[PDB]
Design a protein around this nucleic acid. Structure first.
Lengths: 493, 475, 486, 184, 349
RNA sequence: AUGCGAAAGCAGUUGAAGACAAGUGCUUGUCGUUCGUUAAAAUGGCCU
């Protein structure tokens, strides 16, 4: 004797654009939250060591949010003018913040009382500030002077290394993970520069012609750079020193860009981008950077960032809207005598000779309609299938199963008008869809065959059939012009 | 260990072992060289058996027990053949036999000569200055049995006819427990409680050599021509001395060492091994008492050998009459459709008031919301003019998007029908130029073929419904 | 009721009726404990042990109308589990073998009989075996090539058997039907489960493809039409279960059955592809998306001729480029890359179509050189380097009307190193064709002009394949599995 | 150079040839309940129960006697009618089997024992009518047979003993019925 | 030396058995395990260890086929709806009983089963039998060799315990008399050869809260005999009752008075009674409570007098839960909660 | 339901005798009966 096969629920033939696992993941990112700020929001960052925090820049307001309660946890506001950008050290204790007056404040996280150091670079406003990622005492900044300056936080006074060769309004840079000596700068005239520090550095090692003003640059690999500039964005390789791809599947200039990897996801690595149109998209660097997901917020979304790879906590997705809106979308995550009495439970038998097991796996819920099918209660199974809160698809598989076993007239013999009417209501609802149409058509055929005389009698049933006839003529028509347009397909091949 | 004592037959093919089973000694013989659980129990709950031996024509064994008596026990016949007795109430310590003479040795230092075939006590016997004694053996003098050996920590050589000791070699500290004649010139003494074995030479009466074990010795056996010595050792191990009687060579080391280990890392001991000319037998215990054997060629094995034996330690009960997982091998695995993708052979794949500007914008980009607005847009004239202003490639992707939209949201189909109609109307030339029309237009194809497939049964339902409708409306 | 017994002490009444269940009736309480699923009908059942330890019972497996197919069971009563499940190779044929009769129930269906129905059926069946000159007996039988295991496409359930142990190892349902959750009685018996038409293995040996059809319940609007389903199953080379990777409904459109399946050569897709050949002339080629995780169609050629031929065949060159579709009366060579006639730019009389004497039922290729085509009149061996027929062989007398088109292809099979073997069968007539038969089998060579070797066997031969160490296996009406070796 | 032979065996040879359903089962289990005996169409198999294994398979193509009894190519009429464990000739020799053909043939073999090329052959006379049943209580045997003069069958009961002389099987007409329809 | 001392036991020890023929000690406790020990005076070693999964044990007994005696079973049951059975050398052969033939509502848990023997008496073959404590009178009675459902009987009130009694009659002829006991103090006595009828019913004197019953002296499920020639008729009846009392009864006159009088009362104990057992002879009555340490005593019969030099305050007993003599050797193995059995050997045996 | 055919369809088919039951020698039925041809019921459901 073998166990009882489960009644297999039906699957329709597939429809185009099935929901992919990527869609499951990135739409499960949910439970949106909105915060209104004073002014535009420029830069966003996350704390790398214990990912439980992220930082937001704004007009004279640097706010630290906690990954646990999504409210502001800390505020820095000693800023005399518009603070541009915030960056957390690769070991977290310390953040840098580049203002517009012409200086950077570098001081340790969680302590707005200490201005640990104030460094005065060139007097022009500084748009970009960051920490290194291979050294922890080297901090990079640039200012409208188009010269990017590397300071060593041990020496506050002289630029540890000035760096020129740019063109106009330098506003991005990044480091190369593998090489602790290689720095890429996104100038604002395009033409990405690549520098090696251990040389003189006056000129870049080389340049890349990203024709539009390029806005952002990230190192996705020790070998691959992602360049956010203009309407499209491009991906470059280092050793070959040639561009690899572009994606331009947006409306406006791509604006914000960030890469994450090696985190729990059916996708191994992810790249997210912000394109001025509510549209933030998720690509992967393994499918040649194809579009995988997207959201739309109203205003021009200027910044975007994700919780890093070792979040181990409720993951977050931060978007900054030039309309002055911070938005976040997240995914959440007896008595001692009695025990000395019966202490034999938590043993599981490690150290005996031969271990037997036989217990049956706890099978899933046996629904009532399946139960009626099992116990031959065909009419009861049908009525259960027509109780309200059941899924249309499951009801369809129920009807298909009953037809396949063939007890159709069986389940319908004892039926009286009060029993028919829920059947007929579902019939009227279901006739519209395709597979639903076929099966319900068969069913109503046999219903008519049995119940002509009671149809004569009952007044309600007659208007039921009237409505049925209206709908069936309508769909007959729609099918007809459907066949006409397939006719044009055949022509216009 | 629970195997209190045991010994092979000469030639080592059956082993007789004595162990206790709930207040009774029981003896059992089992084969080694290719289960017979016929065991013999001692009826008395008190008395034990002190020593055992074999006898070769009919084969049997000999049991010297506490009572002061001897049993000659038939092996195949479950019975002691005869109950030899000494005229006293004492305790038999050892026995020995060769030919027909039998000699047994008391604790009270009584010696006894017995005839087997006569079932008789030939002679009681006792001497001077053998105050304590626990070992007896008799030498290979032919059929003569003169100059036998007794021992208690000082080995004594004695002749029978004049009834006096001759040679006393310096023994060990403990009582001695094994005394076996190696050669007509040499005999081995193994004193229990020590790792040191004494090879002694008889005529010179002198200490030839000393042999070192590594743990304490329990059992000694020797091969045919002093070729090898096998020692079962108390931690549970086998020590093999090869040619120990050759050329300070006074102290000689264990040449070869043997242990027994299961796969789970457990160690199990050996007890009463047996060796022969290029043939080695080892005995051990699977369960508490079931004896098991292994035969091998020690001449080719390395100097140190760690035998591995498959034992069922934590193995799991894969019952044969079942599958690996519950099921039984007469079932029939059912219809587990599982998560298969399902498809049909119609998914042809893998082979003036206008809004033209905004629709083309959204399709260059991709926005469900903006597309949804321009689709709630209605006026047919507007749709026509837009498609006229539209560019072909955007038109093609428009067809794909619209058909997908229909496929999901069926109800919208009508207005989307007129949309797709105008689209393929206006932009026919470019698409007839572009080759891979089936795959490029895929979803529209499959959607419309599905509806086509609907048509005939739909007609069937329509006609039956007319039949019934006229039926009841006529009256 | 089919079987009855009392146990040795008699307080337990075993009942072994039709519905796949055995009941144990405790007499005194007038009650019952009963085993409700046992893979067929209890033809016999009794208690065996001197104490009541084991039950024995003989089962029918009545799904197969073609033959009453017994199966034996010794059953530990204590657990009510099965200690001995004795089996047989259980094929299914075109028509019932000599003097095999459906058992008895309250009604007469295509599975059961009434009593006067039983007698009348018996006499008419014997008369038909005497009279008709259309009878045939041949069945698809398939070789697991990497494990060399016989598969029988028993209806809706595959039976995995093998000779090396002489024993069946597995029995798997492959149909979303009425498969096991039911003991059919009368009109469930009227109904019949969907039918497995074809089973093939991918040459690589990690896939089956199965084609099956399903029939609606009788007497209703949807009854007249059919439906045809195709299913791709995976498994790893060690377990003994099959996992349905991808199902396809209605290939080539509704009621457009796939008539023949060709696994792809190793060359094209590591043998990870298949061809479905219709009864219209349409040809589809299915492959496996590996960057996705499924099978899908990739290369089609869809003509819809206004004629129907139930007989088709097709073959593929080892190169993976030359494809030979023999539709009725005409063969065509097609390029794999274009699926079109191989145009002769040189025009060396290598015309893309061969129009033959008769409709083609079988095509095969031995090498890059020789094509073997059986028309129900003749066998024809044609050279390919020079477009001329090498050998003709008169077969028309041997096969007059005793075959429904489409079985000679699995009768004739060819060693792809050495050659091919012919299959002819006859019944000796005595002054009238008797029941006994006789089959001559001649091993033919690559040229076919020389007969490699003739043999003759008595009992009717129902199938042949060839084990891939260049030897051959033949399946006989009696489940006597025989071998032709070197 | 090419050998064509029969190797694998199927069909189990029910007692359908009766069709009157005396006892459709024919197999019997061992005296030591480790072994079961299933006579197929072409070979008789020994099934060991603690591992579900056909230990040895007894083809009918090796020994000519079985080939002469069941493998005559003119007609397959001769086939098993019964099978017992003990030995008819000597009382309590063990590894013995006795097989009974419809056509009066009794053949004695050695299950788990090499088939010596002289298995104990015996024939039963009086079988102008066909045989249907053979069985025994202690010592004594009874046999049922089918004969005729309604498309029905006369069942002749005989008492069977053995050895007035070696080949001779003593048969006496116990009883008879003219037209049976069901009989268990 | 502690039997368990060979290979520890991680829970209480819930039941013990001495195999009737070979020297084997079966120990089973809520560790979901089974252990079989070979018993020396000195060196008890771990013969085997069958550890289930997802099942406790609350009684495991040896049992021998009475007609074959080359077949020995071990019957395991916990608080579930099944009883495992184990046959008797590489990886074991274990079967299950779970299938009640419609009498299912009675026995919702198999936690109290006693194994016995029975002869059919029309045919005179014997088979093993398993008795099951049920709901409100239902002793449900299963055919051991088969797994079927033989017969059901119902004592009234609430069942609390029972026992098996034997009578020989003539050569190869005997009869099993179930003796069941509702808590209140009403004792039924059914026979089993003929289907379950009430041979005789009586009221125990006093004994309100009655929990255990045993018989001893002849043969019984604690000293199971070897062949039907070895079956004797039992002599001593013990009713151990909740407050700590034991009433000892002489069968010869209890049966023939049918409203008997206790022959003696033992109330040295003070806590709840759990285990009554006898030595195979019937000379020693071992009683043992379960609610406190040091709670065991032995009683001399027919004196009906408690022994007074054992066990003293230096007897490392612990909360005794299972009392097991051995048939021949003279051992008494006692199993306490802390996870250890302990041995004592009696010398007079 | 036979043959032929495609998943359509095209042709063809429904004979007697015997027997027995019920009914008034006669009416109906029935068949564990024959030859001849291509020939809906017993309140009664699936284990742990």
């Amino acid at each position: 004797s073998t166990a009882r096969p489960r009644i297999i629920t039906s699957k329709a033939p597939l429809l185009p654009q099935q929901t992919t696992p990527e869609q499951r993941y990135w739409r499960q990112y949910t439970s949106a939250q909105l915060v209104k700020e004073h002014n535009s929001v420029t830069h966003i960052s996350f704390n790398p060591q214990h990912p439980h925090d992220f930082a937001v820049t704004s007009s004279t307001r640097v706010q630290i949010f906690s990954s646990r309660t999504r409210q502001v946890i800390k505020t820095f506001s000693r800023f005399k003018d518009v603070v541009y950008s915030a960056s957390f050290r690769s070991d977290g204790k310390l953040l840098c913040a580049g203002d517009a007056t012409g200086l950077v404040s570098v001081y340790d996280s969680y302590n707005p009382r200490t201005i640990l150091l104030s460094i005065n670079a060139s007097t022009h406003p500084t748009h970009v500030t960051k920490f290194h990622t291979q050294d922890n005492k080297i901090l990079a900044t640039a200012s409208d002077d188009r010269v990017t300056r590397l300071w060593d936080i041990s020496n506050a006074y002289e630029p540890q290394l000035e760096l020129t060769g740019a063109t106009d309004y330098v506003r991005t840079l990044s480091f190369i993970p593998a090489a602790p000596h290689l720095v890429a700068t996104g100038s604002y005239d395009g033409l990405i520069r690549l520098y090696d520090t251990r040389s003189s550095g006056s000129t870049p090692i080389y340049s890349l012609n990203h024709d539009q003003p390029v806005e952002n640059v990230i190192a996705v690999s020790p070998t691959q750079i992602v360049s956010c500039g203009g309407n499209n964005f491009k991906v470059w390789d280092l050793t070959s020193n040639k561009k690899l791809y572009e994606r331009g599947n947006f409306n406006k200039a791509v604006t914000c860009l960030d890469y994450v990897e090696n985190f729990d996801s059916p996708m191994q690595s992810a790249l997210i981008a912000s394109s001025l149109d509510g549209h933030v998209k998720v690509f992967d660097p393994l499918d040649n950077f194809q579009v995988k997901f997207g959201w739309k917020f109203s205003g021009p979304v200027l910044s975007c960032a994700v919780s890093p790879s070792t979040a181990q906590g409720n993951r977050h997705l931060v978007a900054g809207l030039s309309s002055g809106l911070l938005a976040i979308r997240t995914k959440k995550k007896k008595s001692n005598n009695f025990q000395r009495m019966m202490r034999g439970s938590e043993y599981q038998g490690d150290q005996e000779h031969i271990i037997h097991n036989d217990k049956v796996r706890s099978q899933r819920r046996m629904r009532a309609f399946e139960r009626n099918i099992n116990q031959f209660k065909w009419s009861e199974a049908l009525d259960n299938a027509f109780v309200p809160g059941m899924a249309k698809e499951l009801t369809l598989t129920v009807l298909q199963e009953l037809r396949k076993r063939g007890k159709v007239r069986v389940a319908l013999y004892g039926r009286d008008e009060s029993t028919l009417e829920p059947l007929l209501n579902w019939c009227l609802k279901g006739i519209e869809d395709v597979r639903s149409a076929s099966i319900v058509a068969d069913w109503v055929a046999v219903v008519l065959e049995l119940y002509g005389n009671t149809l004569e009698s009952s007044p309600v049933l007659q208007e039921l059939m009237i409505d049925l006839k209206t709908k069936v003529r309508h769909e007959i028509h729609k099918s007809k012009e459907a066949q006409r347009i397939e006719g044009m397909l055949q022509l216009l091949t | 260990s629970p195997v209190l004592q045991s010994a092979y037959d000469p030639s080592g093919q059956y082993l007789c072992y004595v162990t206790v089973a709930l207040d009774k000694q029981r003896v059992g013989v089992q084969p080694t060289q290719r289960w017979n659980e016929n065991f013999l129990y001692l009826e008395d709950s008190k008395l034990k058996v002190t020593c055992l031996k074999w006898v070769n024509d009919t084969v049997a064994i000999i049991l010297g027990m506490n009572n002061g008596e001897i049993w000659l026990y038939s092996v195949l016949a479950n019975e002691v053949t005869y109950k030899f007795t000494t005229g006293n109430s004492y305790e038999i310590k050892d026995i020995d036999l060769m030919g027909n003479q039998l000699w047994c040795i008391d604790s009270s230092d009584a010696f006894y000569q017995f005839d087997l075939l006569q079932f008789k006590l030939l002679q009681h016997f006792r001497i001077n200055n053998c105050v304590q004694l626990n070992k007896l053996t008799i030498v290979p003098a032919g059929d003569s049995v003169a100059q036998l050996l007794v021992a208690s920590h000082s080995i004594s050589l004695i002749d029978i006819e004049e009834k006096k000791v001759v040679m006393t070699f310096p023994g060990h500290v403990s009582p001695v427990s094994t005394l076996q004649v190696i050669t007509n010139e040499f005999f081995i003494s193994g004193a229990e409680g020590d790792r040191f074995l004494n090879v002694y030479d008889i005529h010179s009466g002198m200490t030839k050599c000393v042999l070192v074990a590594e743990s304490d010795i329990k059992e000694l056996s020797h091969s045919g021509q002093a070729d090898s010595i096998a020692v079962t050792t108390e931690d549970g191990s086998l020590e093999i001395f090869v040619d120990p009687l050759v050329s300070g060579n006074k102290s000689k080391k264990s040449s070869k060492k043997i242990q027994i280990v299961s796969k789970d890392g457990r160690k199990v001991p050996i007890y009463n091994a047996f060796i022969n000319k290029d043939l080695l037998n080892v005995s051990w215990l699977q369960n508490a008492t079931m004896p098991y054997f292994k035969n091998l060629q020690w001449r080719e094995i390395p100097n140190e050998y760690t035998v591995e034996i498959s034992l069922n330690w934590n193995n799991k009960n894969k019952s044969a009459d079942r599958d690996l997982h519950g099921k039984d091998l007469a079932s029939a695995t059912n219809y587990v459709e599982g998560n298969a993708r399902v498809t049909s052979g119609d998914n042809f794949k893998h082979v003036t008031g206008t809004v033209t500007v905004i629709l083309s914008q959204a399709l260059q980009s991709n926005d469900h919301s903006l597309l949804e607005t321009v689709l709630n847009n209605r006026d047919e004239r507007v749709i026509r003019d837009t498609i006229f202003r539209l560019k072909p490639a955007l038109a093609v992707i428009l067809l794909e998007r619209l058909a997908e939209r229909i496929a999901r949201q069926t109800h919208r189909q009508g207005p989307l029908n007129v949309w797709v109609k105008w689209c393929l109307i206006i932009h026919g030339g470019y698409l007839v130029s572009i080759p891979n029309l089936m795959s490029t237009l895929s979803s529209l194809h499959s959607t419309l073929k599905r509806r086509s497939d609907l048509l005939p049964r739909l007609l069937a339902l329509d006609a039956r419904l007319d039949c019934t409708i006229n039926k009841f409306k006529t009256l | 009721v089919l079987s009855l017994s009392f146990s040795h002490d008699g307080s337990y009444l075993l009942s072994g009726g039709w519905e796949k269940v055995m009941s144990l009736w405790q007499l005194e309480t007038n009650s019952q404990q009963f085993l409700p699923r046992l893979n067929g009908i209890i033809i016999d059942c009794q208690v065996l042990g001197p104490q009541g330890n084991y039950y024995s019972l003989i089962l029918q497996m009545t799904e197969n109308n073609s033959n009453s197919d017994y199966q034996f069971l010794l059953l530990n009563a204590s657990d009510l589990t099965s200690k001995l499940s004795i089996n047989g190779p259980l094929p299914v044929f075109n028509s019932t073998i000599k003097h095999i009769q459906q058992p008895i129930s309250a009604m007469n269906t295509k599975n059961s009989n009434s009593i006067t129905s039983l007698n009348h059926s018996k006499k008419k069946q014997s008369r038909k075996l005497i009279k008709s000159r259309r009878q045939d007996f041949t069945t698809n039988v398939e070789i697991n090539p990497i494990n060399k295991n016989l598969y029988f496409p028993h209806i809706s359930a595959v039976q995995i058997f093998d000779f090396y142990k002489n024993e069946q190892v597995n029995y798997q349902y492959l149909t979303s039907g009425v498969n096991n959750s039911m003991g059919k009685v009368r009109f469930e018996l009227n109904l019949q489960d969907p039918i497995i038409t074809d089973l093939k293995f991918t040459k690589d040996g990690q896939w089956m493809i199965t084609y099956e059809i399903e029939y609606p319940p009788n007497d209703l609007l949807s009854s007249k039409d059919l439906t045809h389903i195709l299913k791709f199953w995976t498994k790893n080379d060690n377990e003994t279960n099959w996992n349905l990777k991808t199902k396809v409904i209605n290939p080539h459109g509704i009621s457009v059955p796939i008539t023949k399946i060709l696994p792809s050569p190793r060359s094209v897709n590591n043998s990870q592809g298949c061809l479905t050949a219709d009864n219209n002339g349409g040809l589809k080629f299915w492959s496996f998306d590996s960057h996705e995780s499924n099978w899908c169609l990739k290369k089609i050629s869809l003509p819809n001729f206004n004629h129907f031929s139930n007989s088709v065949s097709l073959a593929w060159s080892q190169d993976g480029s030359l494809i030979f579709h023999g539709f009725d009366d005409k063969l065509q060579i097609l390029d794999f890359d274009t699926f079109k006639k191989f145009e002769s730019l040189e025009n060396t009389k290598t015309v893309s179509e061969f129009t033959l004497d008769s409709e083609i039922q079988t095509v095969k290729l031995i090498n890059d050189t020789n094509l073997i085509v059986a028309t129900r009149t003749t066998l024809n061996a044609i050279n390919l380097l020079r477009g001329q027929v090498i050998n003709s062989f008169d077969l028309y007398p041997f096969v007059n009307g005793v075959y429904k088109n489409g079985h000679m292809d699995r009768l004739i099979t060819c060693d792809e190193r050495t050659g091919n073997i012919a299959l002819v069968i006859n019944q000796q007539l005595t002054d009238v064709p008797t029941i006994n038969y006789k089959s001559r089998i001649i091993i033919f060579d690559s040229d076919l002009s020389t007969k490699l070797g003739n043999f003759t066997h008595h009992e009717y031969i129902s199938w042949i394949g060839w084990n891939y160490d260049t030897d051959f296996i033949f399946l006989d009406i009696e489940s006597t599995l025989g071998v032709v070796g070197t | 150079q090419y050998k064509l032979s029969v190797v694998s065996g199927g069909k189990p040879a029910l007692n359908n040839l009766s069709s009157v359903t005396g006892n459709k089962n024919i197999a019997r289990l061992s005296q030591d309940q480790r072994n079961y005996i299933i006579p197929f169409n072409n070979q008789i198999k020994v099934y060991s129960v603690e591992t579900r294994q056909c230990v040895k398979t007894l083809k009918f193509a090796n020994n000519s006697l079985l080939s002469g009894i069941f493998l005559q190519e003119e007609e397959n009429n001769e086939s098993i009618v019964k099978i017992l464990l003990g030995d008819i000739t000597v009382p309590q020799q063990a590894h013995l089997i006795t097989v009974f053909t419809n056509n009066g043939h009794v053949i004695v073999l050695n299950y788990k024992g090499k088939l010596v090329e002289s298995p104990k052959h015996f024939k039963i006379s009086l079988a102008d009518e066909k045989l249907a049943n053979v069985f025994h209580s202690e010592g004594n045997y009874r046999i049922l047979t089918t004969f005729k003069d309604n498309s029905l069958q006369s069942y002749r009961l005989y008492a069977l003993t053995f050895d007035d002389a070696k080949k001779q099987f003593e048969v006496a007409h116990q009883a008879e019925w003219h037209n049976v329809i069901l009989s268990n | 030396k502690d039997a368990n001392a060979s290979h520890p036991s991680h829970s209480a020890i819930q039941s013990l058995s001495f195999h009737p023929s070979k020297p084997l000690l079966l120990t089973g406790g809520y560790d979901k395990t089974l252990r079989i020990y070979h018993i020396d005076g000195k060196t008890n070693h771990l013969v085997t260890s069958l550890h289930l999964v997802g099942s406790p044990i609350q009684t495991c007994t040896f049992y021998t086929s009475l007609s074959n005696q080359n077949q020995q079973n071990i019957f395991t049951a916990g608080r579930r709806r099944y009883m495992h059975s184990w046959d008797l050398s590489q990886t074991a052969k274990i079967e299950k009983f779970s299938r009640l033939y419609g009498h299912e509502s009675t026995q919702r848990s198999f936690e109290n089963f006693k194994v016995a023997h029975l002869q059919n008496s029309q045919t005179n073959s014997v088979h093993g039998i398993v008795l099951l404590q049920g709901n409100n009178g239902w002793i449900n009675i299963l055919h051991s060799t088969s797994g079927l459902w033989l017969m059901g009987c119902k004592i009234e009130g609430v069942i609390t315990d029972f026992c098996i009694d034997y009578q020989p009659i003539s050569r190869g002829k005997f009869r099993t008399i179930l003796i069941a006991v509702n808590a209140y103090g009403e004792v039924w006595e059914f026979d089993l050869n003929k289907n379950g009828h009430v041979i005789r019913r009586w009221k125990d004197q006093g004994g309100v809260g009655i929990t255990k019953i045993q018989v001893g002296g002849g043969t019984t499920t604690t000293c199971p005999a070897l062949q039907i020639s070895k079956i004797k008729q039992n002599r001593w009846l013990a009713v151990g009752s909740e407050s700590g009392f034991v009433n000892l009864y002489d069968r010869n006159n209890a049966m023939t008075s049918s409203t008997p009088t206790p022959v003696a009362a033992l109330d040295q104990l003070t806590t709840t009674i759990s285990n009554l057992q006898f030595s195979p002879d019937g000379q020693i009555l071992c009683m043992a409570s379960r609610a406190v340490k040091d709670a065991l005593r032995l009683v001399h019969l027919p004196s009906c007098s408690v022994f007074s030099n054992w066990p003293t305050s230096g007897t490392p007993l612990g909360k005794v839960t299972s009392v097991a003599f051995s048939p021949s050797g003279g051992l008494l193995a006692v199993g306490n909660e802390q996870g250890k059995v302990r041995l004592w050997k009696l010398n007079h045996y």
